[PDB]
């Protein structure tokens, strides 16, 4: 008989199977549609999630109750050290999908890029790309590279560059990994000849995030969510809890199927892996593209709040540390925990909305302690509240008298 009352089913059947992601990094499954009228450009960048904070800004949209009024928006800070281009790959269209034509490697590759080819790099012979280096720049090596490049011009419809992260430049103590994260970045815009020209010009060079994205644009985020291991149906799928009277347990699905079909359907909620799934998230507005603190210390200083602050909150980002490189401030939240590498992709949905077109001007960036109810924005503000402490007197007295 039919169910007594109707309610929507729990969970999205399009995110199946709810299994662990094949990779820990975020990878774009598709790239934004190529349009030949634009100049060649890169379409993605790899960043690292540092932490979260909140900002203050005026809202510009007319007709709203918050028009020309201040709002508070949570933001995510992602560290974006520059990326190194190490290779060029070309794809030709076939009736069974894209096929790689070949790979043009750079003449020199970084040590941290070659570490990706080893499980124990320090105790290995470290012979990666040693024969490729000797073969290249020779008479036959130069011809082979030219022939591969000509094949891209003749048969390729898609041109991608091979880029890798710089964990030496990140200088993060909690990240752990020393082998670079390698990904392919599609070159959109222009003709195929123009795409190869830009890719060749980028070989062995550093690429900054601000040359791939702009301050007020939106972007897509490809990332892997935080893992929770095995979880029950209540948490994994959001089913209701059974009454306290229930024998043999409450956090269960009461009926996992009718008598016929004499099977459990794939649409029934079951316990299993929860979290650590790859997700492509849409329309994350960039709120700031920050410069490295070594270059510009006043990262969190705005035209309205003149306090000299960096983006790093008092006491550091919890479990991550200091943001020492360029960074991207995305509106809202992104999937995955801190320290995790993430891919920022140029948006694929239309960007004609008023919300997506709005120009963002930050008025205040919070830098209070993320540890336990931060009430000071800077260390100087904390000093003015307390003044000299007992440990300040001891340190000063020894310096004032014993050393002088």
């Amino acid at each position: 008989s039919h169910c007594k009352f109707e309610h929507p089913r729990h969970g999205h059947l399009g995110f199946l199977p709810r299994k662990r992601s094949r990779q820990i990094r975020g990878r774009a499954r598709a790239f934004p549609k190529d349009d030949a009228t634009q100049k060649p450009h890169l379409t993605s960048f790899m960043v690292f999630k540092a932490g979260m904070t909140h900002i203050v800004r005026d809202v510009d949209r007319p007709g709203s109750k918050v028009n020309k009024k201040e709002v508070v928006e949570p933001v995510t800070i992602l560290e974006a050290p520059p990326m190194v281009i190490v290779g060029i790959v070309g794809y030709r269209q076939t009736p069974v999908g894209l096929k790689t034509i070949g790979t043009v490697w750079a003449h020199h590759t970084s040590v941290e890029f070659r570490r990706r080819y080893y499980k124990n790099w320090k105790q290995s012979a470290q012979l990666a790309f040693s024969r490729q280096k000797q073969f290249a720049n020779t008479k036959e090596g130069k011809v082979a590279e030219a022939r591969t490049l000509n094949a891209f011009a003749k048969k390729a419809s898609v041109i991608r560059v091979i880029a890798h992260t710089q964990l030496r430049k990140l200088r993060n103590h909690r990240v752990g990994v020393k082998k670079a994260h390698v990904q392919e970045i599609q070159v959109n815009g222009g003709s195929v000849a123009a795409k190869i020209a830009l890719a060749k010009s980028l070989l062995e060079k550093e690429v900054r995030v601000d040359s791939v994205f702009q301050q007020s644009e939106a972007c897509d985020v490809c990332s892997v969510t935080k893992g929770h291991g095995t979880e029950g149906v209540v948490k994994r799928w959001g089913v209701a809890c059974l009454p306290r009277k229930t024998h043999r347990g409450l956090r269960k699905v009461a009926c996992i199927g009718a008598w016929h079909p004499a099977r459990v359907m794939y649409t029934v909620a079951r316990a299993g892996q929860h979290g650590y799934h790859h997700r492509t998230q849409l329309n994350k507005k960039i709120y700031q593209i920050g410069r490295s603190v070594a270059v510009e210390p006043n990262q969190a200083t705005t035209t309205y709040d003149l306090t000299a602050k960096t983006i790093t909150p008092m006491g550091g980002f919890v479990g991550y540390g200091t943001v020492r490189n360029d960074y991207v401030m995305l509106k809202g939240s992104v999937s995955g925990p801190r320290r995790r590498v993430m891919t920022l992709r140029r948006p694929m949905a239309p960007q004609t909305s008023r919300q997506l077109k709005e120009k963002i001007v930050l008025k205040f960036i919070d830098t209070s302690s993320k540890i336990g109810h931060g009430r000071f924005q800077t260390k100087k503000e904390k000093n003015q509240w307390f003044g000299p402490l007992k440990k300040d007197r001891i340190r000063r007295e020894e310096r004032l008298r014993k050393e002088r």
């Binding site: 269209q93 009736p95 069974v96 359907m265 794939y266």
Partner: protein
């Protein structure tokens, strides 16, 4: 597919030359889908190695909408409790022909799978088949002898493109380039073709006279 190093090493030790099995290449353009499949299925069961090309130009009787609805009724059949390991609906015209041949074979026997594995299907004519030799047709499965030309018919590629096939434009672009390249090559080699024609015509005046009379008796001169 890709040969093993042991296989390559054995061949060099044997010192053999390049080998190609006897393969029949069928041009399926303007062929009735069911009649071509039945003929090909019997030939596969007789031990023939068959490669079919231009599967996107096969024909089915009736309007395109009627045959599109026929495929959509096939698409809706799936194992409800688990669509994986359910019926697998292939959208490409070459896979549609392969499925049609498979249903005309004893697919659940080793002998039937030997016949099925001897068939290779393609959309268009790929480069590895272009120069292998002359293509064949099936006269009893051809459209202009099978359909009354007043009746509407569908082209398999046009039907497949609207039910999920995503490479209709790729095949069309590749087929356009193939015909231009083949036409340019055929526009060349004309001098070679006419040179041999005049050599056969002029040779009649150089051979012994009684050999010419024998040729005339059997209609070769």
């Amino acid at each position: 597919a890709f040969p093993s190093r042991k296989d390559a090493f054995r061949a060099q030790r044997k010192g053999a030359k390049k080998h190609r099995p006897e393969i029949i290449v069928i041009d399926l353009k303007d062929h009735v889908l069911g009649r071509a499949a039945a003929v090909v299925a019997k030939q596969l069961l007789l031990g023939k190695k068959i490669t079919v090309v231009r599967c996107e130009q096969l024909n089915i009787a009736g309007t395109e909408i009627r045959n599109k609805i026929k495929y959509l009724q096939y698409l809706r059949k799936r194992k409800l409790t688990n669509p994986t390991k359910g019926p697998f609906h292939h959208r490409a015209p070459s896979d549609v022909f392969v499925r049609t041949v498979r249903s005309m074979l004893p697919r659940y026997t080793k002998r039937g799978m030997k016949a099925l594995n001897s068939l290779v299907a393609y959309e268009g004519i790929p480069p590895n088949v272009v120069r292998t030799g002359g293509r064949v047709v099936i006269p009893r499965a051809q459209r202009h002898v099978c359909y009354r030309s007043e009746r509407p018919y569908t082209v398999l590629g046009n039907m497949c493109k609207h039910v999920g096939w995503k490479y209709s434009d790729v095949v069309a672009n590749l087929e356009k380039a193939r015909v231009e390249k083949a036409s340019r090559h055929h526009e060349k080699q004309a001098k070679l073709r006419d040179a041999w024609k005049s050599a056969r015509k002029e040779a009649l005046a150089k051979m012994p006279k009684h050999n010419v009379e024998v040729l005339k008796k059997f209609g070769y001169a």
